[PDB]
Structure formats: structure tokens, C-alpha cells
Scaffold this active site. Structure first.
Site, PDB file in Angstrom:
ATOM      1  N   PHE A 141       4.625  11.948   3.614  1.00 34.88           N
ATOM      2  CA  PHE A 141       3.673  12.516   4.490  1.00 34.88           C
ATOM      3  C   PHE A 141       3.206  13.759   3.943  1.00 34.88           C
ATOM      4  O   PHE A 141       2.907  14.559   4.956  1.00 34.88           O
ATOM      5  CB  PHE A 141       4.332  12.474   5.860  1.00 34.88           C
ATOM      6  CG  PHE A 141       4.672  11.000   6.391  1.00 34.88           C
ATOM      7  CD1 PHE A 141       3.695  10.532   6.825  1.00 34.88           C
ATOM      8  CD2 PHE A 141       5.677  10.683   6.203  1.00 34.88           C
ATOM      9  CE1 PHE A 141       3.731   9.072   7.560  1.00 34.88           C
ATOM     10  CE2 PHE A 141       5.835   9.288   6.647  1.00 34.88           C
ATOM     11  CZ  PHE A 141       4.951   8.465   7.331  1.00 34.88           C
ATOM     12  N   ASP A 222       8.230   0.468   1.409  1.00 36.71           N
ATOM     13  CA  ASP A 222       6.807   0.922   1.073  1.00 36.71           C
ATOM     14  C   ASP A 222       6.200   0.293  -0.210  1.00 36.71           C
ATOM     15  O   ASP A 222       6.810   0.617  -1.486  1.00 36.71           O
ATOM     16  CB  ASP A 222       6.949   2.495   1.018  1.00 36.71           C
ATOM     17  CG  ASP A 222       5.429   3.234   0.583  1.00 36.71           C
ATOM     18  OD1 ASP A 222       4.431   2.458   0.317  1.00 36.71           O
ATOM     19  OD2 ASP A 222       5.431   4.381   0.527  1.00 36.71           O
ATOM     20  N   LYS A 251      -3.378  -1.034  -1.392  1.00 36.44           N
ATOM     21  CA  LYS A 251      -4.194  -1.038  -2.851  1.00 36.44           C
ATOM     22  C   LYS A 251      -4.476  -2.476  -3.466  1.00 36.44           C
ATOM     23  O   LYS A 251      -5.590  -2.764  -2.787  1.00 36.44           O
ATOM     24  CB  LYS A 251      -2.961  -0.508  -3.925  1.00 36.44           C
ATOM     25  CG  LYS A 251      -3.168   1.111  -3.945  1.00 36.44           C
ATOM     26  CD  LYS A 251      -2.242   1.751  -4.916  1.00 36.44           C
ATOM     27  CE  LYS A 251      -2.519   3.303  -5.170  1.00 36.44           C
ATOM     28  NZ  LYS A 251      -1.512   3.958  -5.900  1.00 36.44           N
TER      29      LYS A 251
END
Lengths: 401, 383
Positions: A141, A222, A251
Site C-alpha cells: 500500500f 495477491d 493486469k
């Protein structure tokens, strides 16, 4: 007049100077190839950081975009659109989850996964509404936290997070054994791609997933970079026999044709989400969905997971042979066609950059990260003959340097 | 068969329940109109929260997307692409700034504008790294929250601690609660106060920008040129997530290449779309259209208000308008009014329970706008 230097000088004059690209100006892409403004052809060995898994300008993905763009591209979530439901059914069935929450960027999807985990930890697990923590292995983050200031108006430690080393089961077990009651989730990439390519020890993902379940902590995979066939499986979790509690995709979910990202989870997690909070205007729009459905179909129809697995093994085997012939490369690491080489020089040295300039002159495009690492990640549609040609280009470049 | 209910049920089963949409399933859009799965046509009076300013499926924007997507859509910033420089030159020239930083989302652009102001205040103003504060308006350490449309509150914060403040970040019109237009002179006096105290003025025009309020950006209404301009939404006509931060070199000089980047920001497809979307706004004089039709719309709605107790007032600028329903925020009246509007061929949705946004695409004609007024009148008077 409008050559490559013309475009570079336009950006110098009128664009923020926040990037340092390799000095090549691309204007066309098709499959594994891109062409610069002067017409020179190159193998793309970056795939736009593993978004272009399906190759540039894939006819099926182009076709889906053009079809949907002429029908309807954006309604917002104030209304339903006819494509989102079809896409949601498709991707949840494909990956074995009850529900998906669609977003646009990778950061949005990671942010949303963490918010979902915190809400689950309040509604189901019973942690106080500001007291849940997220275990992380990197700065997932960056730019949106207060450490000392956050940019979002609406040792160093980041409140809300516990940072442990990557690839460190003992550190994870230590945190879980001591304060699992405070922890909503462990958020981890199956391969870390931020500072190169960091492949964890065999068994790390599965042991992490099992420890999280034992301690009533969500396991969040992730896979913004590792997902969609790049590592030789539809998601990298499949290599390790892991089904995560929350899956993050991005992506290559769109082939790079449109910013599309997603958060998947079963009902026992996702149904803590209720209408009301401030959301995303573009997330789940019909153009994004049409593109993502086509991008997923390419991956399955062309068996790109199997292709990336087989060609990745061949690639690393050949690069290992090259490493034995030179003092310039220390190691090659990766899974599928997500690979990288460590150059035998310091992170402050110019060697990897100069090697990338030499690769470019020989028809192959790559860029260093962290000074001395070169990522090597072509589109998954590369053929065996093309892959071996790329090995020959890399060999020539290294051996002549 | 795959009717509207079929798609609604697919989403209930396989999509997160983070929204409660109006129960209409759209499958085509053209200009001001959208069609549902059963083929019924509606006026779109939301414009996807003011992203579809140029109308749905605008031929020039579809053209640009098709041309560029067929050629090259994404390189990442690891390499240059041949469209970004041309787009940067176009938008900076159009708006009168030296440089632009291209991004994807509105929140990305707001966060980038904040980070840029803080870096400016460190390198130029001399505030320590994590010490600069940002003033913002009520609709969080490091942010000072003051009421919107309140010059006195801004002046008090500046007089007390401007030396530790990097910027004031403000929307020319607040669209969150409904449509809160500030007092005449608020934006210009705010801009002047910031300059006097060596504080950056950041105009957040993600919602107000690109012709919606009757000027290319709403700052132009007030003769404000902000230090940092934030754009989003209609910058792409809704065809692609595109946002931007613009500033002159005295601010952008602090920017150097960093460790983390954006894969999609500035990609050639985004740039081709945004160039076409900007050309539509200028070529079709959509600022002028929104100004003239917005005045007509508010005047007509004011006449309707005379005939009903259901609507309290109408507010807005250009074609960014909203009506306040004469009921509580916890009531269902505005929602029920929107269901009835839908039946009569016009799509809108409430916000904050008792406000209905009324914001059609800027390409609407006078004849269509008056027809929309007739639909609203019919719905109100029959309710």
C-alpha cells in the site's frame, strides 16, 4: 520530422518527469513483437510488467473491445449492464469461487481485498472495527498509508499492518501464535515481483495457507502479477494446491487492453459487503467485462498455462547454461514465463542498464529493476522457435559484452 | 431466456452486493439514449456520474479507440509510446499548464495532486517532509477539514498555520451530497487567499471538468487558474479510465523518477481516447451547449416546482443539476420517484435519500431537453 526523438522531446516538455524509460518509442504491437517509430522490430520481454500475457493486439481481444465499444461502454453501477452478470458467472465458475467484485486497477483490487478482510473480521470474527491487522511481506500500500502521511484525503510501523519478511514461515507462525486474534488476513504474492522476481521456497504458500486456516485468519493471494497463466497455471496458487480465501487478479485479466481487476471470494466472506459505501464508477463496466471475457478465453483456448509451463522450463534451462559461460549473470529465477536474471554488479552500477541497451540493439526489449536485475517475461503466445531465438539473442548479447 | 431478470439474477448470485442499482439492465447506448435488454429506450439523466459528457458511443471516440487498440494498447512506462507526448502537448496547451501527469482513476489523481503539493512545500516552501498539511472541505491526519463554501473558516486556518500548510484542495461545485454550488466569489477569493499565504490552490475537477458546468473547467467561470488541476471522468467520455494532474513547471520541477509506477497510466489507448474526447468537447462547443441548456432546464424545472409539493428546489450549473425532494433522507420517496421516471422513459438515481441528480449528456438538444422536462412533469404530476 516525427521520429523517436520528436516524441521523447514532447514528453520532456509537456509531461511530468516521473519515469526513466528505456529510450525506445513503440508505436505498434502484434503478438510477441513490437515496432518502434523508425520501424525496427523487437521481441517484447517485459509484457508491460506481465499484463500482455496474450500478446499485443490479440485478434480476439481487439474484436471483443471493438464490438462492445460500439454498443455500450459505461453506465456506472447506478444501473445494471448486460455484460457484467455474464462475466461474473464466467470468472467465478472458472476459478471456483462464489462471487467476484470487479474493479479497474491492481491497487484498487488490493485495497478492496483488504477492506473486505477487515469487514469480515468485524462481522464474522468479532474484532473491533478499527483493531484488525493485516500481515504483509512488502509495501503493498505504498503511498496510501501514514507511517510518520497518507495522500488520500477521504522501527517504522504502519498502523493496521504487520510486516514480516517474505518467504519466512517461522515469522508468520510467530505472529499467528502470538496475536492471531487481532489479525484479519495474511496478504501475500505467490512470487514477489516488485524488486525483481522472488520465488519463495517450495511449500511456502501451502504452509502459509494452512497456518492461516488453523488460526482463523484469511489467506489473501495477491495474483495481480502472477495470475492468468503467466507462471504455468491459471493462477500460481494452483502450483501449491492452495485455494485462497480471497483471490486478487489484475493486469493480464484484460490482456492489457483495458484496466480490469477483480477480487474473488466465497459467500461466507463476500456477503459481508452491503450496498451503500462510496464505490467505483468504472468498475464492472460492460467494455471491461467484454474484454476480460475474451482475454480469459484466449488463455484457456490456446492452453497458455501449459505453454508458459513448458517454455518456462526450457527458458530457465537454457539461461542456466548461459550463466555457466559468463561472469556477468549470477542466477536466473522464476516460474513459467515470469523470470529474471541477477546481474553480477551492484544496484548502483550501470551494467544491467547497458546490457538492456545491448539487448535492444539485438532486437529484444527488457528493462532493469533495482539497478542489477533484468526481468525476462515475454507474452505467453511465444512459440518454441521464437523462445530459442530469444535465448540466442540473449546469449549473443551476453557473450559479446 | 436471457431477459432483464436473468441478468439481475446472475449478478445477485455471482457478484458482490456492493451496489443497489435501479432495476434496469442496459445493453446499448447512443448519445443521450440507452436501451434495456427488452429494447425499451430511455434518456440517460446520470451520464455515469458525469463521465459520459460526450454521449454514449460517440463516433469520434469509438473511432479513436478502434484505431489505437488495433495498433498498440499498452507498453507500460518501461518504454515510450508514440501517443503520450502528443496527448500531453494537446491537454497542456488547451488548459494553459506546462505539464501533465497522466493516471487512470479519479482517486489516483487526487492522491497524486496531494503528494505533489507536499513535495512542492518541502522543496520550495521549506516544510519538513511529513509536516505539510492539506486543507480540504467537509463533504485523517495531515488534513485540515473546514466547511465547504466558508471563506471565514479558510481565512482562520491560513492566519493560524499557513506556514505548515502545502495546499487547499477544493471542488468548484460539490457533487457528493447533491449539487452544492458555492457563493459567488468563493472560488476566486479562496484562490487569492492561498496565493497571499504561499499555499497551493488545487482544483478537483474530476466531476466538474470537461464542459459539464458550461465552461471547459468550472474554474473558468470564476477566473481562477489553479496551481494544480485534477481531471477525470469525462476526460475519456467514459470510454476508458483516464485521469490527469496538471501544473506549471514551478510545481512539476520537484518530480523525479520513483520506485513504484503505474502500468496503465499514460498508455497509448488511454491517450488516443482522451484526445478524441477533448476534440468532441471543443468541436461541438459542448461548454456553450451545457450553459444554454442548463439555464433552460433549471428555468423549466422551476415552473414545474410551482405545480407540486414534491420538489423543494433545483440547483446546479450547466447540466450538473439536482432536485431536493420534499421528504427526509431516510425516506423512500426519491427512489420511488426514480422508479416512476424509469417507467416514463428517463433514468435517474437518488443520492443521500432525498436528492435526485439530473445530468444528461451535453450533446442533448433543446427539443430533447424539453421532452425530458415533459417526462419529469408527467411523472411528478401523476405521482
Amino acid at each position: 520530422t516525427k521520429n523517436s526523438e520528436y516524441f521523447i522531446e514532447l514528453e520532456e516538455k509537456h509531461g511530468a518527469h516521473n519515469y526513466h524509460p528505456l529510450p525506445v518509442v513503440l508505436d505498434r504491437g502484434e503478438g510477441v513483437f513490437v515496432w518502434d517509430v523508425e520501424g525496427k522490430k523487437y521481441y517484447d520481454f517485459l509484457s508491460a510488467y506481465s499484463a500482455v500475457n496474450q500478446g499485443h493486439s490479440h485478434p480476439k481481444i481487439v474484436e471483443a473491445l471493438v464490438e462492445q465499444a460500439s454498443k455500450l461502454a459505461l453506465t456506472s453501477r447506478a444501473f445494471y449492464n448486460s455484460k457484467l452478470g455474464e462475466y461474473e458467472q464466467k470468472i467465478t465458475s472458472l476459478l471456483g469461487f462464489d462471487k467476484v467484485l470487479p474493479m479497474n486497477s491492481g491497487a484498487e483490487a488490493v485495497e478492496t481485498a483488504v477492506k473486505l478482510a477487515r469487514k469480515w473480521s468485524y462481522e464474522v470474527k468479532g474484532i473491533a472495527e478499527n483493531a484488525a491487522k493485516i500481515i504483509v511481506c512488502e509495501n503493498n500500500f505504498h503511498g496510501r498509508t501514514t507511517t510518520i502521511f497518507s495522500n488520500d484525503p477521504d522501527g517504522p510501523f504502519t498502523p493496521g499492518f504487520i510486516r514480516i519478511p517474505y518467504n519466512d514461515i517461522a515469522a508468520l507462525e510467530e505472529v499467528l501464535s502470538k496475536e492471531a486474534g487481532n489479525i484479519a488476513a495474511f496478504l501475500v504474492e505467490p512470487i514477489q515481483g516488485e524488486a525483481g522476481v522472488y520465488v519463495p521456497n517450495e511449500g511456502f504458500l501451502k504452509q502459509s495457507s494452512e497456518l492461516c486456516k488453523k488460526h482463523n485468519v484469511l489467506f489473501i493471494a495477491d495474483e495481480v502479477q502472477t495470475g492468468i497463466a503467466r507462471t504455468g497455471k491459471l493462477i500460481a496458487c494452483h502450483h501449491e494446491d492452495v485455494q485462497p480465501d480471497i483471490l486478487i487478479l489484475g493486469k493480464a485479466l484484460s490482456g492489457g487492453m483495458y484496466p480490469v481487476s477483480a477480487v474473488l471470494a466465497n459467500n461466507n466472506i463476500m456477503d459481508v459487503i452491503k450496498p451503500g459505501q462510496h464505490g467505483s464508477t468504472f468498475g464492472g463496466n460492460p467494455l471491461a467485462c467484454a474484454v476480460a471475457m475474451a482475454a480469459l478465453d484466449v488463455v484457456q483456448d490456446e492452453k497458455l498455462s501449459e505453454r508458459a509451463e513448458k517454455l518456462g522450463n526450457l527458458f530457465r534451462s537454457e539461461i542456466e547454461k548461459l550463466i555457466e559461460k559468463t561472469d556477468l549473470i549470477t542466477k536466473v529465477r522464476g516460474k513459467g514465463l515470469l523470470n529474471a536474471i541477477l546481474i553480477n554488479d551492484t544496484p548502483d552500477s550501470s551494467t544491467a542498464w547497458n546490457l538492456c541497451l545491448a539487448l535492444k540493439e539485438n532486437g529484444l526489449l527488457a528493462k532493469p529493476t533495482h539497478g542489477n536485475i533484468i526481468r525476462l517475461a515475454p507474452p505467453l503466445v511465444i512459440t518454441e522457435e521464437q523462445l530459442l531465438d530469444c535465448v540466442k539473442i540473449i546469449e549473443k548479447t551476453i557473450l559479446e559484452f
